[PDB]
C-alpha cells in the first residue's frame, strides 16, 4: 500500500543506473585482501 | 589571500574533506594552535566518516 523506502548512502553509495527495456546482467568481482583478483563466473541469484 | 595547487578531486577525496576555513569556523575563540592538528585529523579518502 503506502510502502516507503529509506535509502542509506553510507551503507550503499551512489546507486547504479539502468534503463527501460534493456537486457541487463550485473558484473560481479571477487576481492581478496582488498585486491581485485578475478571476475566471478559461477551461478548466482538476485532477490528483493 | 593564498591558495593552492589542486582541488578536492584530482587528488582522490571521495567524500568531503576538512579545510582550513571550515576548521577555523568550527573553533570559535581558541587560538589557531589548538584548532586543527594530528589529534583532529579525519581522512578524506573515507566513504564513511
Ligand atoms: C599523500 O597524500 C596523498 C593524497 O594527496 C595520499 O594518496 C592517497 O592515499 C590513500 C591512502 O593510502 C590511497 O588510498 C585509496 O583509498 C580508497 C578507499 O576506498 C575504499 O573503497 C572501499 C569500497 O570499494 C571501501 O570499503 C573502503 O572503506 C574505502 O572507502 C581506495 O578506493 C583507493 O583505491 C584506488 O585508488 C586509485 C588511486 O589512483 C584510484 O584510481 C582507484 O579508482 C581506487 O580508488 C586507494 O586504496 C589513495 O590511492 C592515494 N591517492 C593518490 C592519488 O595517491 C598519500 O597516501 C599521502 N602520502 C602518505 C605517505 O600517506
Ligand atoms: C600543480 O602545479 C604544479 C606546478 O608546480 C604541477 O606540477 C607538475 O606536475 C607534473 C606531473 O608529474 C610534473 O611533470 C611537472 O614537472 C610539475 N611542474 C612543476 C613546476 O613542478 C601540478 O601538475 C599541478 N597540479 C594540478 C592538479 O594541476
mmCIF file with all atom_site columns, C-alpha atoms and ligand atoms in Angstrom:
data_model
loop_
_atom_site.group_PDB
_atom_site.id
_atom_site.type_symbol
_atom_site.label_atom_id
_atom_site.label_alt_id
_atom_site.label_comp_id
_atom_site.label_asym_id
_atom_site.label_entity_id
_atom_site.label_seq_id
_atom_site.pdbx_PDB_ins_code
_atom_site.Cartn_x
_atom_site.Cartn_y
_atom_site.Cartn_z
_atom_site.occupancy
_atom_site.B_iso_or_equiv
_atom_site.pdbx_formal_charge
_atom_site.auth_seq_id
_atom_site.auth_comp_id
_atom_site.auth_asym_id
_atom_site.auth_atom_id
_atom_site.pdbx_PDB_model_num
ATOM   1   C CA  . UNK A 1 1  ? 0.000  0.000   0.000   1.00 0.00 ? 1  UNK A CA  1
ATOM   2   C CA  . UNK A 1 2  ? 1.698  3.166   1.276   1.00 0.00 ? 2  UNK A CA  1
ATOM   3   C CA  . UNK A 1 3  ? 5.089  1.463   1.449   1.00 0.00 ? 3  UNK A CA  1
ATOM   4   C CA  . UNK A 1 4  ? 8.109  3.730   1.811   1.00 0.00 ? 4  UNK A CA  1
ATOM   5   C CA  . UNK A 1 5  ? 11.842 3.137   1.296   1.00 0.00 ? 5  UNK A CA  1
ATOM   6   C CA  . UNK A 1 6  ? 14.727 4.702   3.243   1.00 0.00 ? 6  UNK A CA  1
ATOM   7   C CA  . UNK A 1 7  ? 17.892 4.913   1.168   1.00 0.00 ? 7  UNK A CA  1
ATOM   8   C CA  . UNK A 1 8  ? 21.200 4.697   3.052   1.00 0.00 ? 8  UNK A CA  1
ATOM   9   C CA  . UNK A 1 9  ? 24.060 6.437   1.264   1.00 0.00 ? 9  UNK A CA  1
ATOM   10  C CA  . UNK A 1 10 ? 26.732 5.349   3.750   1.00 0.00 ? 10 UNK A CA  1
ATOM   11  C CA  . UNK A 1 11 ? 25.986 1.631   3.511   1.00 0.00 ? 11 UNK A CA  1
ATOM   12  C CA  . UNK A 1 12 ? 25.387 1.611   -0.254  1.00 0.00 ? 12 UNK A CA  1
ATOM   13  C CA  . UNK A 1 13 ? 26.824 4.620   -2.071  1.00 0.00 ? 13 UNK A CA  1
ATOM   14  C CA  . UNK A 1 14 ? 25.747 6.061   -5.409  1.00 0.00 ? 14 UNK A CA  1
ATOM   15  C CA  . UNK A 1 15 ? 23.161 3.686   -6.916  1.00 0.00 ? 15 UNK A CA  1
ATOM   16  C CA  . UNK A 1 16 ? 23.604 2.177   -10.363 1.00 0.00 ? 16 UNK A CA  1
ATOM   17  C CA  . UNK A 1 17 ? 21.705 3.399   -13.427 1.00 0.00 ? 17 UNK A CA  1
ATOM   18  C CA  . UNK A 1 18 ? 19.928 1.158   -15.952 1.00 0.00 ? 18 UNK A CA  1
ATOM   19  C CA  . UNK A 1 19 ? 17.212 1.928   -18.485 1.00 0.00 ? 19 UNK A CA  1
ATOM   20  C CA  . UNK A 1 20 ? 13.791 0.674   -19.545 1.00 0.00 ? 20 UNK A CA  1
ATOM   21  C CA  . UNK A 1 21 ? 13.504 -2.453  -21.716 1.00 0.00 ? 21 UNK A CA  1
ATOM   22  C CA  . UNK A 1 22 ? 17.193 -3.383  -21.933 1.00 0.00 ? 22 UNK A CA  1
ATOM   23  C CA  . UNK A 1 23 ? 18.522 -6.878  -21.160 1.00 0.00 ? 23 UNK A CA  1
ATOM   24  C CA  . UNK A 1 24 ? 21.000 -6.473  -18.297 1.00 0.00 ? 24 UNK A CA  1
ATOM   25  C CA  . UNK A 1 25 ? 23.010 -8.732  -16.040 1.00 0.00 ? 25 UNK A CA  1
ATOM   26  C CA  . UNK A 1 26 ? 25.293 -7.332  -13.335 1.00 0.00 ? 26 UNK A CA  1
ATOM   27  C CA  . UNK A 1 27 ? 29.034 -7.870  -13.329 1.00 0.00 ? 27 UNK A CA  1
ATOM   28  C CA  . UNK A 1 28 ? 30.437 -9.120  -10.020 1.00 0.00 ? 28 UNK A CA  1
ATOM   29  C CA  . UNK A 1 29 ? 34.082 -9.268  -8.937  1.00 0.00 ? 29 UNK A CA  1
ATOM   30  C CA  . UNK A 1 30 ? 35.864 -11.318 -6.269  1.00 0.00 ? 30 UNK A CA  1
ATOM   31  C CA  . UNK A 1 31 ? 38.136 -9.438  -3.871  1.00 0.00 ? 31 UNK A CA  1
ATOM   32  C CA  . UNK A 1 32 ? 40.876 -10.960 -1.726  1.00 0.00 ? 32 UNK A CA  1
ATOM   33  C CA  . UNK A 1 33 ? 42.528 -8.654  0.835   1.00 0.00 ? 33 UNK A CA  1
ATOM   34  C CA  . UNK A 1 34 ? 41.155 -5.542  -0.854  1.00 0.00 ? 34 UNK A CA  1
ATOM   35  C CA  . UNK A 1 35 ? 42.648 -6.527  -4.226  1.00 0.00 ? 35 UNK A CA  1
ATOM   36  C CA  . UNK A 1 36 ? 40.774 -7.242  -7.448  1.00 0.00 ? 36 UNK A CA  1
ATOM   37  C CA  . UNK A 1 37 ? 41.706 -10.793 -8.357  1.00 0.00 ? 37 UNK A CA  1
ATOM   38  C CA  . UNK A 1 38 ? 39.109 -12.376 -10.667 1.00 0.00 ? 38 UNK A CA  1
ATOM   39  C CA  . UNK A 1 39 ? 35.655 -11.776 -12.094 1.00 0.00 ? 39 UNK A CA  1
ATOM   40  C CA  . UNK A 1 40 ? 33.076 -14.164 -10.665 1.00 0.00 ? 40 UNK A CA  1
ATOM   41  C CA  . UNK A 1 41 ? 31.682 -16.589 -13.240 1.00 0.00 ? 41 UNK A CA  1
ATOM   42  C CA  . UNK A 1 42 ? 29.673 -19.055 -11.130 1.00 0.00 ? 42 UNK A CA  1
ATOM   43  C CA  . UNK A 1 43 ? 25.900 -19.386 -10.883 1.00 0.00 ? 43 UNK A CA  1
ATOM   44  C CA  . UNK A 1 44 ? 24.320 -16.715 -8.689  1.00 0.00 ? 44 UNK A CA  1
ATOM   45  C CA  . UNK A 1 45 ? 20.855 -15.351 -7.946  1.00 0.00 ? 45 UNK A CA  1
ATOM   46  C CA  . UNK A 1 46 ? 19.387 -11.953 -7.077  1.00 0.00 ? 46 UNK A CA  1
ATOM   47  C CA  . UNK A 1 47 ? 16.373 -11.068 -4.955  1.00 0.00 ? 47 UNK A CA  1
ATOM   48  C CA  . UNK A 1 48 ? 14.408 -8.251  -3.341  1.00 0.00 ? 48 UNK A CA  1
ATOM   49  C CA  . UNK B 2 1  ? 44.881 35.653  0.091   1.00 0.00 ? 1  UNK B CA  1
ATOM   50  C CA  . UNK B 2 2  ? 46.880 32.480  -0.525  1.00 0.00 ? 2  UNK B CA  1
ATOM   51  C CA  . UNK B 2 3  ? 45.716 29.456  -2.490  1.00 0.00 ? 3  UNK B CA  1
ATOM   52  C CA  . UNK B 2 4  ? 46.930 26.022  -3.526  1.00 0.00 ? 4  UNK B CA  1
ATOM   53  C CA  . UNK B 2 5  ? 47.763 23.819  -6.447  1.00 0.00 ? 5  UNK B CA  1
ATOM   54  C CA  . UNK B 2 6  ? 44.914 21.380  -6.949  1.00 0.00 ? 6  UNK B CA  1
ATOM   55  C CA  . UNK B 2 7  ? 41.311 20.736  -5.987  1.00 0.00 ? 7  UNK B CA  1
ATOM   56  C CA  . UNK B 2 8  ? 39.470 18.221  -3.844  1.00 0.00 ? 8  UNK B CA  1
ATOM   57  C CA  . UNK B 2 9  ? 39.154 15.855  -6.779  1.00 0.00 ? 9  UNK B CA  1
ATOM   58  C CA  . UNK B 2 10 ? 42.251 15.197  -8.940  1.00 0.00 ? 10 UNK B CA  1
ATOM   59  C CA  . UNK B 2 11 ? 43.804 14.045  -5.652  1.00 0.00 ? 11 UNK B CA  1
ATOM   60  C CA  . UNK B 2 12 ? 41.192 11.475  -4.663  1.00 0.00 ? 12 UNK B CA  1
ATOM   61  C CA  . UNK B 2 13 ? 38.882 12.804  -1.938  1.00 0.00 ? 13 UNK B CA  1
ATOM   62  C CA  . UNK B 2 14 ? 35.890 10.513  -2.326  1.00 0.00 ? 14 UNK B CA  1
ATOM   63  C CA  . UNK B 2 15 ? 33.980 12.459  0.319   1.00 0.00 ? 15 UNK B CA  1
ATOM   64  C CA  . UNK B 2 16 ? 34.017 15.964  1.821   1.00 0.00 ? 16 UNK B CA  1
ATOM   65  C CA  . UNK B 2 17 ? 37.389 16.713  3.409   1.00 0.00 ? 17 UNK B CA  1
ATOM   66  C CA  . UNK B 2 18 ? 38.410 19.159  6.141   1.00 0.00 ? 18 UNK B CA  1
ATOM   67  C CA  . UNK B 2 19 ? 39.774 22.524  5.021   1.00 0.00 ? 19 UNK B CA  1
ATOM   68  C CA  . UNK B 2 20 ? 41.261 25.450  6.899   1.00 0.00 ? 20 UNK B CA  1
ATOM   69  C CA  . UNK B 2 21 ? 38.192 27.703  6.677   1.00 0.00 ? 21 UNK B CA  1
ATOM   70  C CA  . UNK B 2 22 ? 35.796 25.052  7.995   1.00 0.00 ? 22 UNK B CA  1
ATOM   71  C CA  . UNK B 2 23 ? 38.142 24.217  10.867  1.00 0.00 ? 23 UNK B CA  1
ATOM   72  C CA  . UNK B 2 24 ? 38.552 27.898  11.788  1.00 0.00 ? 24 UNK B CA  1
ATOM   73  C CA  . UNK B 2 25 ? 34.771 28.381  11.670  1.00 0.00 ? 25 UNK B CA  1
ATOM   74  C CA  . UNK B 2 26 ? 34.465 25.245  13.815  1.00 0.00 ? 26 UNK B CA  1
ATOM   75  C CA  . UNK B 2 27 ? 36.501 26.541  16.783  1.00 0.00 ? 27 UNK B CA  1
ATOM   76  C CA  . UNK B 2 28 ? 35.162 29.966  17.829  1.00 0.00 ? 28 UNK B CA  1
ATOM   77  C CA  . UNK B 2 29 ? 37.526 31.616  20.299  1.00 0.00 ? 29 UNK B CA  1
ATOM   78  C CA  . UNK B 2 30 ? 40.548 29.374  20.950  1.00 0.00 ? 30 UNK B CA  1
ATOM   79  C CA  . UNK B 2 31 ? 43.901 30.294  19.342  1.00 0.00 ? 31 UNK B CA  1
ATOM   80  C CA  . UNK B 2 32 ? 44.815 28.772  15.999  1.00 0.00 ? 32 UNK B CA  1
ATOM   81  C CA  . UNK B 2 33 ? 47.255 26.329  17.661  1.00 0.00 ? 33 UNK B CA  1
ATOM   82  C CA  . UNK B 2 34 ? 44.505 24.078  19.072  1.00 0.00 ? 34 UNK B CA  1
ATOM   83  C CA  . UNK B 2 35 ? 42.155 24.316  16.056  1.00 0.00 ? 35 UNK B CA  1
ATOM   84  C CA  . UNK B 2 36 ? 43.489 21.671  13.675  1.00 0.00 ? 36 UNK B CA  1
ATOM   85  C CA  . UNK B 2 37 ? 46.162 19.091  14.376  1.00 0.00 ? 37 UNK B CA  1
ATOM   86  C CA  . UNK B 2 38 ? 47.042 15.394  14.452  1.00 0.00 ? 38 UNK B CA  1
ATOM   87  C CA  . UNK B 2 39 ? 44.563 14.905  17.291  1.00 0.00 ? 39 UNK B CA  1
ATOM   88  C CA  . UNK B 2 40 ? 41.840 16.128  14.909  1.00 0.00 ? 40 UNK B CA  1
ATOM   89  C CA  . UNK B 2 41 ? 42.820 14.552  11.572  1.00 0.00 ? 41 UNK B CA  1
ATOM   90  C CA  . UNK B 2 42 ? 39.953 12.830  9.793   1.00 0.00 ? 42 UNK B CA  1
ATOM   91  C CA  . UNK B 2 43 ? 40.955 11.377  6.406   1.00 0.00 ? 43 UNK B CA  1
ATOM   92  C CA  . UNK B 2 44 ? 39.093 12.271  3.240   1.00 0.00 ? 44 UNK B CA  1
ATOM   93  C CA  . UNK B 2 45 ? 39.577 9.011   1.324   1.00 0.00 ? 45 UNK B CA  1
ATOM   94  C CA  . UNK B 2 46 ? 36.871 7.784   3.623   1.00 0.00 ? 46 UNK B CA  1
ATOM   95  C CA  . UNK B 2 47 ? 33.393 6.970   2.157   1.00 0.00 ? 47 UNK B CA  1
ATOM   96  C CA  . UNK B 2 48 ? 32.050 6.619   5.710   1.00 0.00 ? 48 UNK B CA  1
ATOM   97  C CA  . UNK B 2 49 ? 33.216 9.344   8.111   1.00 0.00 ? 49 UNK B CA  1
HETATM 98  C C1  . LIG C 3 .  ? 49.951 11.927  0.420   1.00 0.00 ? 1  LIG C C1  1
HETATM 99  O O1  . LIG C 3 .  ? 48.691 12.458  0.060   1.00 0.00 ? 1  LIG C O1  1
HETATM 100 C C2  . LIG C 3 .  ? 48.021 11.672  -0.938  1.00 0.00 ? 1  LIG C C2  1
HETATM 101 C C3  . LIG C 3 .  ? 46.754 12.412  -1.295  1.00 0.00 ? 1  LIG C C3  1
HETATM 102 O O2  . LIG C 3 .  ? 47.034 13.736  -1.729  1.00 0.00 ? 1  LIG C O2  1
HETATM 103 C C4  . LIG C 3 .  ? 47.760 10.252  -0.434  1.00 0.00 ? 1  LIG C C4  1
HETATM 104 O O3  . LIG C 3 .  ? 47.315 9.493   -1.553  1.00 0.00 ? 1  LIG C O3  1
HETATM 105 C C5  . LIG C 3 .  ? 46.207 8.601   -1.314  1.00 0.00 ? 1  LIG C C5  1
HETATM 106 O O4  . LIG C 3 .  ? 46.443 7.723   -0.235  1.00 0.00 ? 1  LIG C O4  1
HETATM 107 C C6  . LIG C 3 .  ? 45.361 6.817   0.021   1.00 0.00 ? 1  LIG C C6  1
HETATM 108 C C7  . LIG C 3 .  ? 45.737 6.042   1.262   1.00 0.00 ? 1  LIG C C7  1
HETATM 109 O O5  . LIG C 3 .  ? 46.989 5.389   1.099   1.00 0.00 ? 1  LIG C O5  1
HETATM 110 C C8  . LIG C 3 .  ? 45.131 5.915   -1.191  1.00 0.00 ? 1  LIG C C8  1
HETATM 111 O O6  . LIG C 3 .  ? 44.059 5.025   -0.867  1.00 0.00 ? 1  LIG C O6  1
HETATM 112 C C9  . LIG C 3 .  ? 42.839 4.890   -1.636  1.00 0.00 ? 1  LIG C C9  1
HETATM 113 O O7  . LIG C 3 .  ? 41.698 4.695   -0.791  1.00 0.00 ? 1  LIG C O7  1
HETATM 114 C C10 . LIG C 3 .  ? 40.414 4.346   -1.430  1.00 0.00 ? 1  LIG C C10 1
HETATM 115 C C11 . LIG C 3 .  ? 39.451 3.907   -0.339  1.00 0.00 ? 1  LIG C C11 1
HETATM 116 O O8  . LIG C 3 .  ? 38.244 3.457   -0.957  1.00 0.00 ? 1  LIG C O8  1
HETATM 117 C C12 . LIG C 3 .  ? 37.754 2.255   -0.323  1.00 0.00 ? 1  LIG C C12 1
HETATM 118 O O9  . LIG C 3 .  ? 36.616 1.744   -1.028  1.00 0.00 ? 1  LIG C O9  1
HETATM 119 C C13 . LIG C 3 .  ? 36.043 0.538   -0.472  1.00 0.00 ? 1  LIG C C13 1
HETATM 120 C C14 . LIG C 3 .  ? 34.886 0.109   -1.354  1.00 0.00 ? 1  LIG C C14 1
HETATM 121 O O10 . LIG C 3 .  ? 35.403 -0.305  -2.601  1.00 0.00 ? 1  LIG C O10 1
HETATM 122 C C15 . LIG C 3 .  ? 35.602 0.826   0.975   1.00 0.00 ? 1  LIG C C15 1
HETATM 123 O O11 . LIG C 3 .  ? 35.096 -0.363  1.566   1.00 0.00 ? 1  LIG C O11 1
HETATM 124 C C16 . LIG C 3 .  ? 36.785 1.364   1.791   1.00 0.00 ? 1  LIG C C16 1
HETATM 125 O O12 . LIG C 3 .  ? 36.361 1.662   3.109   1.00 0.00 ? 1  LIG C O12 1
HETATM 126 C C17 . LIG C 3 .  ? 37.392 2.583   1.131   1.00 0.00 ? 1  LIG C C17 1
HETATM 127 O O13 . LIG C 3 .  ? 36.394 3.574   1.160   1.00 0.00 ? 1  LIG C O13 1
HETATM 128 C C18 . LIG C 3 .  ? 40.595 3.237   -2.476  1.00 0.00 ? 1  LIG C C18 1
HETATM 129 O O14 . LIG C 3 .  ? 39.403 3.099   -3.227  1.00 0.00 ? 1  LIG C O14 1
HETATM 130 C C19 . LIG C 3 .  ? 41.748 3.562   -3.398  1.00 0.00 ? 1  LIG C C19 1
HETATM 131 O O15 . LIG C 3 .  ? 41.844 2.549   -4.401  1.00 0.00 ? 1  LIG C O15 1
HETATM 132 C C20 . LIG C 3 .  ? 42.113 3.079   -5.730  1.00 0.00 ? 1  LIG C C20 1
HETATM 133 O O16 . LIG C 3 .  ? 42.899 4.286   -5.721  1.00 0.00 ? 1  LIG C O16 1
HETATM 134 C C21 . LIG C 3 .  ? 43.319 4.681   -7.037  1.00 0.00 ? 1  LIG C C21 1
HETATM 135 C C22 . LIG C 3 .  ? 44.272 5.849   -6.898  1.00 0.00 ? 1  LIG C C22 1
HETATM 136 O O17 . LIG C 3 .  ? 44.801 6.156   -8.182  1.00 0.00 ? 1  LIG C O17 1
HETATM 137 C C23 . LIG C 3 .  ? 42.059 5.013   -7.871  1.00 0.00 ? 1  LIG C C23 1
HETATM 138 O O18 . LIG C 3 .  ? 42.437 5.352   -9.194  1.00 0.00 ? 1  LIG C O18 1
HETATM 139 C C24 . LIG C 3 .  ? 41.092 3.808   -7.890  1.00 0.00 ? 1  LIG C C24 1
HETATM 140 O O19 . LIG C 3 .  ? 39.916 4.141   -8.610  1.00 0.00 ? 1  LIG C O19 1
HETATM 141 C C25 . LIG C 3 .  ? 40.763 3.355   -6.481  1.00 0.00 ? 1  LIG C C25 1
HETATM 142 O O20 . LIG C 3 .  ? 40.034 4.426   -5.906  1.00 0.00 ? 1  LIG C O20 1
HETATM 143 C C26 . LIG C 3 .  ? 43.006 3.697   -2.581  1.00 0.00 ? 1  LIG C C26 1
HETATM 144 O O21 . LIG C 3 .  ? 43.148 2.487   -1.850  1.00 0.00 ? 1  LIG C O21 1
HETATM 145 C C27 . LIG C 3 .  ? 44.933 6.748   -2.455  1.00 0.00 ? 1  LIG C C27 1
HETATM 146 O O22 . LIG C 3 .  ? 45.003 5.932   -3.619  1.00 0.00 ? 1  LIG C O22 1
HETATM 147 C C28 . LIG C 3 .  ? 46.037 7.797   -2.601  1.00 0.00 ? 1  LIG C C28 1
HETATM 148 N N1  . LIG C 3 .  ? 45.770 8.667   -3.734  1.00 0.00 ? 1  LIG C N1  1
HETATM 149 C C29 . LIG C 3 .  ? 46.724 9.061   -4.584  1.00 0.00 ? 1  LIG C C29 1
HETATM 150 C C30 . LIG C 3 .  ? 46.284 9.953   -5.702  1.00 0.00 ? 1  LIG C C30 1
HETATM 151 O O23 . LIG C 3 .  ? 47.893 8.710   -4.454  1.00 0.00 ? 1  LIG C O23 1
HETATM 152 C C31 . LIG C 3 .  ? 49.033 9.620   0.119   1.00 0.00 ? 1  LIG C C31 1
HETATM 153 O O24 . LIG C 3 .  ? 48.701 8.422   0.813   1.00 0.00 ? 1  LIG C O24 1
HETATM 154 C C32 . LIG C 3 .  ? 49.758 10.566  1.076   1.00 0.00 ? 1  LIG C C32 1
HETATM 155 N N2  . LIG C 3 .  ? 51.031 10.001  1.492   1.00 0.00 ? 1  LIG C N2  1
HETATM 156 C C33 . LIG C 3 .  ? 51.151 9.142   2.510   1.00 0.00 ? 1  LIG C C33 1
HETATM 157 C C34 . LIG C 3 .  ? 52.541 8.665   2.805   1.00 0.00 ? 1  LIG C C34 1
HETATM 158 O O25 . LIG C 3 .  ? 50.184 8.765   3.160   1.00 0.00 ? 1  LIG C O25 1
HETATM 159 C C1  . LIG C 3 .  ? 50.131 21.878  -9.522  1.00 0.00 ? 2  LIG C C1  1
HETATM 160 O O1  . LIG C 3 .  ? 51.084 22.753  -10.031 1.00 0.00 ? 2  LIG C O1  1
HETATM 161 C C2  . LIG C 3 .  ? 52.324 22.060  -10.221 1.00 0.00 ? 2  LIG C C2  1
HETATM 162 C C3  . LIG C 3 .  ? 53.342 23.087  -10.647 1.00 0.00 ? 2  LIG C C3  1
HETATM 163 O O2  . LIG C 3 .  ? 54.382 23.195  -9.686  1.00 0.00 ? 2  LIG C O2  1
HETATM 164 C C4  . LIG C 3 .  ? 52.186 20.908  -11.221 1.00 0.00 ? 2  LIG C C4  1
HETATM 165 O O3  . LIG C 3 .  ? 53.357 20.125  -11.025 1.00 0.00 ? 2  LIG C O3  1
HETATM 166 C C5  . LIG C 3 .  ? 53.802 19.454  -12.209 1.00 0.00 ? 2  LIG C C5  1
HETATM 167 O O4  . LIG C 3 .  ? 53.482 18.070  -12.118 1.00 0.00 ? 2  LIG C O4  1
HETATM 168 C C6  . LIG C 3 .  ? 53.868 17.306  -13.268 1.00 0.00 ? 2  LIG C C6  1
HETATM 169 C C7  . LIG C 3 .  ? 53.333 15.907  -13.063 1.00 0.00 ? 2  LIG C C7  1
HETATM 170 O O5  . LIG C 3 .  ? 54.379 14.973  -12.839 1.00 0.00 ? 2  LIG C O5  1
HETATM 171 C C8  . LIG C 3 .  ? 55.384 17.356  -13.420 1.00 0.00 ? 2  LIG C C8  1
HETATM 172 O O6  . LIG C 3 .  ? 55.772 16.641  -14.588 1.00 0.00 ? 2  LIG C O6  1
HETATM 173 C C9  . LIG C 3 .  ? 55.844 18.804  -13.519 1.00 0.00 ? 2  LIG C C9  1
HETATM 174 O O7  . LIG C 3 .  ? 57.266 18.858  -13.530 1.00 0.00 ? 2  LIG C O7  1
HETATM 175 C C10 . LIG C 3 .  ? 55.314 19.627  -12.344 1.00 0.00 ? 2  LIG C C10 1
HETATM 176 N N1  . LIG C 3 .  ? 55.666 21.029  -12.511 1.00 0.00 ? 2  LIG C N1  1
HETATM 177 C C11 . LIG C 3 .  ? 56.434 21.701  -11.648 1.00 0.00 ? 2  LIG C C11 1
HETATM 178 C C12 . LIG C 3 .  ? 56.705 23.134  -11.988 1.00 0.00 ? 2  LIG C C12 1
HETATM 179 O O8  . LIG C 3 .  ? 56.889 21.176  -10.637 1.00 0.00 ? 2  LIG C O8  1
HETATM 180 C C13 . LIG C 3 .  ? 50.947 20.045  -10.972 1.00 0.00 ? 2  LIG C C13 1
HETATM 181 O O9  . LIG C 3 .  ? 50.624 19.282  -12.129 1.00 0.00 ? 2  LIG C O9  1
HETATM 182 C C14 . LIG C 3 .  ? 49.734 20.892  -10.594 1.00 0.00 ? 2  LIG C C14 1
HETATM 183 N N2  . LIG C 3 .  ? 48.634 20.046  -10.163 1.00 0.00 ? 2  LIG C N2  1
HETATM 184 C C15 . LIG C 3 .  ? 47.418 20.100  -10.718 1.00 0.00 ? 2  LIG C C15 1
HETATM 185 C C16 . LIG C 3 .  ? 46.402 19.148  -10.166 1.00 0.00 ? 2  LIG C C16 1
HETATM 186 O O10 . LIG C 3 .  ? 47.151 20.884  -11.622 1.00 0.00 ? 2  LIG C O10 1
#
